[PDB]
Amino acid sequence: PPQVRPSIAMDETTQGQDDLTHKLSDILKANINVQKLEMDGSPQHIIN
Amino acid sequence: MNAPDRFELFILPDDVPKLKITPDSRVPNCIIIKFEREDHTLANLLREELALYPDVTFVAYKVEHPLFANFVMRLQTEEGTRPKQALERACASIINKLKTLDHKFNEEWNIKN
Amino acid sequence: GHTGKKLMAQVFFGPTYYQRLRHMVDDKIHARARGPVQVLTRQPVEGRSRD
RNA sequence: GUCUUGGGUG
């Protein structure tokens, strides 16, 4: 939940996500990129 | 921010008496006096005046804390005498001594002119 | 000073150069009953200036 | 309101 990775406020209008949130976003991007290889051309040096 | 006022040393509040007398029951004919808003100036004067009376058997004072402007005085007297009466007697005697001292100082100062 | 009586011992007395250091008690005294907490842990924040 | 760096105190 967001409690484990809360955001914060820089100057009254700004927020950066916690490290875990950006890490989870990167994991999601990696997952979707994986689901973009077994659906089309993939010369075995991109799947790995 | 925690400093008390410099006039609470001498200015008596309205809820604080100047003088408060309680008896010491352990020994006969003894009383404990707390003087508020006073210091060593009155205490030592009174103590050394009272210590020289024949009928005063015990007299002492202390200032329990320097940050609080009061002192407490223990005074005992013999059977006939009351410590209170000895206290007025000492006050009157010191008043007379200061009056004589003032008269002689003024005369001396005039002669020096 | 209280009695005007002489002190039985004599006192080493004279001028000495002293310094006023930057550490004053009024810059250090801090108390907290309840106040702001941290976002993540919900525990009291760190700092005299932050309460 | 957050992270690092630096100067310090007992």
From TrEMBL, chain A:
It is found in: Nucleus. Transmembrane segments: none annotated. Belongs to the RNA polymerase beta' chain family. DNA-dependent RNA polymerase catalyzes the transcription of DNA into RNA using the four ribonucleoside triphosphates as substrates. This is DNA-directed RNA polymerase subunit. It comes from Komagataella phaffii (strain GS115 / ATCC 20864) (Yeast). The lineage of its organism: Eukaryota, Fungi, Dikarya, Ascomycota, Saccharomycotina. The chain holds residues 244 to 291 of 1743 of the full protein.
Automatic annotation (TrEMBL), chain B:
It is found in: Nucleus. InterPro entries: RBP11 (IPR037685), RBP11-like (IPR036603), RBP11-like_dimer (IPR009025), RNA_pol_Rpb11_13-16kDa_CS (IPR008193), Rpo11-like (IPR022905). CDD domains: RNAP_II_RPB11. Keywords: DNA-directed RNA polymerase, Nucleus, Transcription. Pfam families: RNA_pol_L_2. GO terms for molecular function: DNA binding; DNA-directed RNA polymerase activity; protein dimerization activity; RNA-directed RNA polymerase activity. The keyword Nucleus applies. One of its GO terms (cellular component) is RNA polymerase II, core complex. Residues 30-102 form the DNA-directed RNA polymerase RBP11-like dimerisation domain. It comes from the Eukaryota. One of its GO terms (biological process) is transcription initiation at RNA polymerase II promoter. Belongs to the archaeal Rpo11/eukaryotic RPB11/RPC19 RNA polymerase subunit family. This is RNA polymerase II subunit B12.5. It comes from Komagataella phaffii (strain GS115 / ATCC 20864) (Yeast).
UniProtKB/TrEMBL annotation, chain C:
DNA-dependent RNA polymerase catalyzes the transcription of DNA into RNA using the four ribonucleoside triphosphates as substrates. The lineage of its organism: Eukaryota, Fungi, Dikarya, Ascomycota, Saccharomycotina. It is found in: Nucleus. It comes from the Eukaryota. Belongs to the RNA polymerase beta chain family. This is DNA-directed RNA polymerase subunit beta. Component of the RNA polymerase II (Pol II) complex consisting of 12 subunits.
